[PDB]
Design a binder for this molecule. Structure first.
Ligand SMILES: Nc1ncnc2c1ncn2[C@@H]1O[C@H](COP(=O)(O)OP(=O)(O)CP(=O)(O)O)[C@@H](O)[C@H]1O
Ligand SMILES: Nc1ncnc2c1ncn2[C@@H]1O[C@H](COP(=O)(O)OP(=O)(O)CP(=O)(O)O)[C@@H](O)[C@H]1O
Ligand SMILES: Cc1ncc(C[n+]2csc(CCOP(=O)(O)O)c2C)c(N)n1
Ligand SMILES: Cc1ncc(C[n+]2csc(CCOP(=O)(O)O)c2C)c(N)n1
Ligand SMILES: [Mg+2]
Ligand SMILES: [Mg+2]
Ligand SMILES: [Mg+2]
Ligand SMILES: [Mg+2]
Ligand SMILES: [Mg+2]
Ligand SMILES: [Mg+2]
Ligand SMILES: [Mg+2]
Ligand SMILES: [Mg+2]
Ligand SMILES: [Mg+2]
Ligand SMILES: [Mg+2]
Lengths: 309, 307
């Protein structure tokens, strides 16, 4: 047999093939805009698979919180507010009910914090834990990742690389972790969607999305969709103290974690610096110019990222 | 230490409802108020080795993915509008499989009149298809409003999907014309979007028969607080089923009451409200308080349980 597999096709070839097979024009952003009653509902889905996004050994509460968060992150990144959610679960017959009870308590906590509601879902048995959450968002103004203008400044929220450091910390399987380390582990396990940026993005963002697979990588989605070149400056990337602590203590380059670190779930949006709002952890990292691709310090850059295939 | 298999499917739903302190959870769709009318939210999953096999024709699976979920929307008087697809795919799955799957999905959407606007992807060891569907209705019809004196109706025929399944599991060299018909009804269910209007106007309670009549009748019985009386001799049996039952020495009634995945509707309303143009069949009547009985006796459900 010589017929092509997904491994050979790659995630981006897969995505393009589905879009083309569906002949859909509404698709390529973090959510799917859909007009309704003059307003625009934002639809999005996300999965967390055991062994792929988390391990059964993790604290279920954190996974339930995260299952909602990463999804709220997509709704927020396009300028919308989370409303209703559905959860589709693949659970092994031998799973502890306490794991599921606790998981949902994490779900409840997140929804109460993001102010959305889990109105239903689905159950099915399976070999391993599968968590698929669907989210419905409401928004006055949709903000894709294609409207970036030239000259615009490139801003990110929070700090980067923390999550990748937290994941490596989790893999060490230590019995005890130092306070700064738990902070990082914290960011990987219970990420928090920047739902506090809705107002801002929805009003002053020309283009926006959330960093989920790594800055450099997702930056390419932005550049491509909009049709510009992304000029990023490493020594302007918001780094974390605990991240620097982890890097000092373990011998790694912080920059390396901020450019190619995943699951940070911060935002990536562009707009005129004249629209900057100092009352938010906003951090300009680069500029939108003519050309194509993403340049870190005026250079190539692989890039590296997550990619399932 | 307590596992999911010991809790049971109803127990797991119960626990989730209580833990989420939810009011909406309870029937086929999730009724949501949004600008005059209500939106209907629902999701269904197809897992490899659980709902289908990798050998099955991929376009049929794509179709079923959409149908099974439309079935829940229709079942509550709504119409399909937007769908999202979350896929778990093994790195070795052939590209043609995903392409053919999306063809069956493409045309399922053209048939039901809904568009797929996005979804998700992830590496995985087994194919997993989680569909999210958003539909809309002018009048939500759940499964708690059955009135005493209402007549109990189902659409099409029952027990076909289970037989089609069994035929597939036999892995015969080749099948008879009728065995292909049954295998088809199992591989390619067809949501009853042609009943939307009848449910929306005249049904008091409604739902689709995904796990089996007797088992799903309970949800309705329990949800409406009534007692559902069913008569086996009134259950609609297709000709292909009778032919299959005859040939393998099986009782058609057993397949009608416990056969799953037929995706027909089960709804109640005054007998007079009966619409002869659609293929509905009265099978029982709504009596007073608790239970689901068949020919007098209170048969114990044998529907498909996940736990
Ligand atoms: N993991 C989950 N999280 C939240 N709600 C869930 C859920 N799994 C199931 N539910 C909800 O519980 C209710 C019903 O389960 P029930 O088994 O009677 O039917 P169903 O509507 O799920 C169709 P089917 O059973 O054929 O897949 C639904 O209203 C659904 O939204
Ligand atoms: N199986 C599938 N079917 C249909 N659309 C899909 C899909 N998998 C992904 N998509 C769609 O393709 C587009 C984007 O993929 P992209 O990888 O850039 O981001 P994402 O929105 O999926 C968020 P993240 O990667 O952080 O989960 C989206 O508009 C999404 O709806
Ligand atoms: C067990 C385990 N191994 C590795 C990682 C790293 N990781 C996995 S998926 C992902 C991006 C997810 O988003 P999406 O699903 O949208 O691709 C990242 C950074 C992890 N979290 N857990
Ligand atoms: C390999 C294999 N073994 C058995 C069956 C039968 N079956 C599985 S799930 C189900 C109900 C599904 O709806 P839900 O997922 O809502 O429970 C039925 C009738 C099958 N299709 N494939
Ligand atoms: Mg994203
Ligand atoms: Mg995802
Ligand atoms: Mg996402
Ligand atoms: Mg990704
Ligand atoms: Mg990406
Ligand atoms: Mg149902
Ligand atoms: Mg289901
Ligand atoms: Mg269903
Ligand atoms: Mg079921
Ligand atoms: Mg059921």
């Amino acid at each position: 047999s010589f017929t092509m597999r997904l491994k050979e096709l790659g995630e981006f070839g897969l995505i393009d093939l589905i879009k083309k097979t569906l002949e859909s024009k509404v698709i390529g952003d973090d959510t799917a805009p859909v007009e309704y009653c003059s307003k625009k509902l934002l639809l999005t889905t996300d999965v967390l698979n055991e062994g792929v996004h988390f391990l059964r050994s993790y604290i279920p509460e954190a996974v339930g919180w995260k299952a909602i968060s990463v999804n709220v992150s997509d709704v927020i990144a396009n300028g919308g507010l989370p409303k209703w959610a559905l959860i589709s679960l693949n659970l092994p017959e031998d799973l502890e009910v306490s794991y599921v009870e606790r998981f949902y308590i994490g779900v409840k906590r997140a929804c109460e914090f993001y102010k959305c509601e889990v109105v239903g879902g689905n159950i099915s048995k399976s070999e391993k834990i599968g968590i698929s959450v669907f989210l419905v968002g409401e928004t006055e103004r949709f903000v894709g990742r294609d409207g970036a203008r030239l000259g615009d400044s490139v801003f990110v929220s929070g700090t980067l690389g923390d999550s990748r450091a937290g994941l490596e910390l989790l893999l060490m399987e230590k019995e005890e972790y130092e306070p700064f380390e738990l902070a990082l582990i914290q960011r990987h396990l219970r990420p928090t969607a920047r739902i506090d940026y809705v107002k801002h993005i929805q009003k002053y963002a020309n283009a926006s999305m959330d960093i989920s697979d790594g800055l450099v990588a997702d930056a390419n989605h932005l550049a491509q969709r909009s049709g510009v070149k992304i000029e990023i400056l490493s020594e302007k990337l918001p780094l974390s103290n605990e991240l620097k602590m982890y890097c000092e203590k373990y011998g790694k380059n912080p920059i390396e974690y901020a450019l190619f670190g995943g699951e940070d779930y911060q935002l990536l949006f562009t707009h005129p610096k004249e629209r900057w709002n100092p009352f938010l952890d906003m951090t300009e990292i680069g500029r939108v110019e003519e050309g194509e691709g993403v340049f870190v310090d005026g250079k190539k850059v692989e890039p590296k990222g997550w990619k399932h295939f």
